[PDB]
Enzyme design. Structure first.
Site, mmCIF file in Angstrom:
data_model
loop_
_atom_site.group_PDB
_atom_site.id
_atom_site.type_symbol
_atom_site.label_atom_id
_atom_site.label_comp_id
_atom_site.label_asym_id
_atom_site.label_seq_id
_atom_site.Cartn_x
_atom_site.Cartn_y
_atom_site.Cartn_z
ATOM 1 C CG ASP A 156 1.970 5.012 4.594
ATOM 2 O OD1 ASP A 156 1.294 3.965 4.674
ATOM 3 O OD2 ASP A 156 3.124 5.117 5.058
ATOM 4 C CG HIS A 193 5.406 0.836 2.897
ATOM 5 N ND1 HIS A 193 4.947 2.038 2.400
ATOM 6 C CD2 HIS A 193 4.805 0.672 4.099
ATOM 7 C CE1 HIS A 193 4.108 2.578 3.266
ATOM 8 N NE2 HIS A 193 4.004 1.769 4.306
ATOM 9 C CG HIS A 237 -0.207 0.127 2.521
ATOM 10 N ND1 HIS A 237 0.281 -0.975 3.190
ATOM 11 C CD2 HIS A 237 0.129 1.202 3.273
ATOM 12 C CE1 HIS A 237 0.877 -0.584 4.302
ATOM 13 N NE2 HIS A 237 0.799 0.732 4.377
ATOM 14 N NE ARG A 242 7.863 -4.149 14.041
ATOM 15 C CZ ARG A 242 7.666 -3.830 12.765
ATOM 16 N NH1 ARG A 242 6.794 -4.513 12.035
ATOM 17 N NH2 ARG A 242 8.339 -2.826 12.219
HETATM 18 FE FE LIG Z 1 2.289 2.075 5.704
#
Ligand SMILES: [Fe+2]
Ligand SMILES: [Fe+2]
Lengths: 197, 189
Positions: free
Chosen positions: A129, A179, A127, A189
């Protein structure tokens, strides 16, 4: 003692406790700041202290407001939006001008803590951002508290894993930093993500 | 007979007269499209024909509505440009920039340089089309991509340059030394 919420009321005590000494010492001279370009136009640099990351995780785990789809909690859901706005427009924005040819920070779209664990599994699709630039801060330690994980920058053909506690990754939001997140295989995490326009 | 304003009413004839053949013949297969990465993530490619560029300038010179520029809506070409961006440019942007989806158009205008600060554009990506001939109707000119440390001069008529608007493509225009320089610029989000 100063807390996460005491910014900018107790700002100098806040900076010494929560800002990484290297970033704070170079607030007015990022030329000699020890940052790394892990791939083209993507930079990793220390920003926060381990105490910042631990206390952010403690606030999020105690609130237990995680979404039931990635498991996250917005900073405004725990009353940290005004403190994060001050962090972005006073600490991160000057560094962005040094990194990206004096680009002026306009506003903050979103800011949240993501919690990857083994209980919830989700699709980690590629995707772009919804941001001009994206800030990604690692909040806990790779290897000690989780295994695998990381982020694949698909256009750069670069996989970034094992980010240090308190260190931030900054990259473009749209067009040039396609990314995907990579799943962990063990433990938990925590990352702090902020979409900035 | 077909004019700039006949899109998409007379689309097939509009494409043949105004869209560059190399671009038109690769709309469904950009893998074989002969475009050039002049610097990292900045691409030059043929887009329009000489007839498109000459007629666009004649519309702007007649209108005289003059960075000395004229927006496309001031000459009734905004709807035609919206069709061009979403039906022709947007598929090429997905091929170049990892399937990025074009959201909307911010600005579209023609700039006229006659006898230049560094800046970011207010766009996700920016389209720059040279409208008249370098060396014949003007000299020098061009663009410098400051972050890329690359001087870009001599863009051919009808050829386009595409680059990021914000953050990653700090740039500035270079002055001309004679004549007039026309470019078609669009800020796309
Ligand atoms: Fe992202
Ligand atoms: Fe520009």
């Amino acid at each position: 003692e100063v807390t996460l919420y005491d910014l900018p009321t107790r700002k100098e005590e806040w900076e010494k406790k929560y800002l990484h000494p290297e970033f704070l010492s170079h607030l007015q001279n990022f030329k000699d700041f020890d940052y790394t370009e892990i791939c083209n136009d993507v930079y990793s640099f220390p920003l926060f202290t381990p105490a910042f990351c631990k206390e952010v995780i403690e606030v999020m785990d105690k609130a237990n407001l995680w979404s039931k789809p990635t498991q996250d909690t917005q900073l405004y859901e725990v009353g940290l939006d005004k403190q994060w706005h001050y962090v972005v427009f006073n600490y991160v924005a000057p560094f962005v001008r040094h990194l990206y040819n004096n680009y002026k920070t306009k506003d903050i779209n979103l800011a949240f803590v993501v919690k990857y664990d083994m209980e919830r599994q989700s699709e980690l699709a590629p995707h772009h951002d919804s941001s001009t630039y994206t800030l990604n801060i690692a909040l806990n330690e790779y290897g000690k508290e989780y295994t695998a994980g990381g982020c694949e920058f698909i256009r750069h053909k670069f996989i970034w894993q094992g980010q240090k506690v308190g260190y931030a990754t900054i990259h473009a939001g749209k067009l040039l930093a396609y990314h995907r997140a990579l799943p962990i295989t063990s433990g938990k995490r925590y990352i702090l993500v902020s979409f900035v326009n």
